[PDB]
């Protein structure tokens, strides 16, 4: 996506939780995923 790498699904949850979750590692993280960008 625009913010966010090709791993990712930005879901801000009905509790107040935007989990930036990677689909290649299946990791739910609140840490900046764009950090992984060098993956390309």
């Amino acid at each position: 996506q625009s913010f966010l790498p090709p791993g990712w699904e930005m879901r801000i949850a009905p509790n107040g939780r935007p989990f930036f979750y990677d689909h290649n590692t299946k990791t739910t993280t609140w840490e900046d995923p764009r950090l992984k960008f060098p993956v390309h």
Binding site: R11, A13, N15, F19, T28, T29, W30
Partner: peptide, 10 residues
């Protein structure tokens, strides 16, 4: 859905 809603519990 199959969207990431599973909050990591620390």
């Amino acid at each position: 859905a199959g969207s990431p809603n599973l909050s990591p519990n620390p």
